[PDB]
């Protein structure tokens, strides 16, 4: 069907979302060359579950969701079926039977700043784990103790979103990684 999938709007976007407010775009009814994308030198992870990456060529009759966001390098492992941790539990959860692809690349050149980039946030606390592909963008004070919070920080009442550091001198595990997750809709 000749019309090219606009994957550049996803991968080459200049802004990426915070992981708690992860971005979802629809790609559908288009053709691509998956190897232009797969062979990119920047990527360090390009993993496909229950699908071959060649299935990204022929999207002529298929709807794909592209989810994107920034996390720390040592958290990329959590963007996978069956994982636990702050990111899988409280920010972005894949289902146990995920079929799709997970792509990640070190973005220190883009997303770190000399004094520290504090723009990217993650959710540190939640009363229960996220369901698959659930988004929680609430900003209510998290009550960790027995005293009600009344809307402001307290001794054990915490604002639930925390900023990543992203200092360009961070170890690689602490550097920012951009992540794209590709999955199918019906």
């Amino acid at each position, epitope marked *: 069907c000749t019309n090219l999938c606009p994957f550049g709007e996803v991968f080459n976007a200049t802004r990426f979302a915070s992981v708690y407010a992860w971005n979802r775009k*629809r790609i559908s009814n288009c053709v691509a060359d998956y190897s232009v994308l797969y062979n990119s030198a920047s990527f360090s992870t390009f993993k496909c579950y229950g699908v071959s990456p060649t299935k990204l060529n022929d999207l002529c009759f298929t709807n794909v*969701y592209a989810d994107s966001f920034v996390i720390r390098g040592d958290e990329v492992r959590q963007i996978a079926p069956g994982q636990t941790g702050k990111i899988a539990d409280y920010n972005y959860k894949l289902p146990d039977d995920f079929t799709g692809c997970v792509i990640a690349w070190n973005s220190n050149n883009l997303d770190s700043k000399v004094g520290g980039n504090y723009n990217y946030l993650y959710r540190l606390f939640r009363k229960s784990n996220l369901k698959p592909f659930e*988004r929680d963008i*609430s900003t209510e004070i998290y009550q960790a103790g027995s005293t009600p919070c009344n809307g402001v920080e307290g001794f054990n009442c915490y604002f639930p979103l925390q900023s990543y550091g992203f200092q360009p001198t961070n170890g690689v595990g602490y550097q920012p990684y951009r992540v794209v997750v590709l999955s199918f809709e019906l």
Partner: nanobody
Amino acid sequence: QVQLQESGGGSVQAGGRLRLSCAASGDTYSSYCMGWFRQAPGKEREGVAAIYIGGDNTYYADSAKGRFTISQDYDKNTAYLQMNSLKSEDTAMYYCAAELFCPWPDIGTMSPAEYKYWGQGTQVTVSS
């Protein structure tokens, strides 16, 4: 396992006002899309407006701008469509709909007619 109950509907004179209600129950998510589409007899479904429950994002079809307002009561999992300045060409069945997995923050890229959950639908008839 999401259920939608819709309220409102009826006959209205041209230039008048009507408000529709859609309450989502069951296994809803922390935030998700709700919206309306409409269908006149003999024509195709058409998206009217959408809102991101839990957020502030809204989107309006061109035919709704400056006349309809979509809003929410998050604690009641309920969306509202206030229709002002109604015209005869607004006569249609109106359906509310909900989608837990919609694109976001650009919720305008998916019609509510494509959403997974649909309400029963209510007749709105605008005369003159």
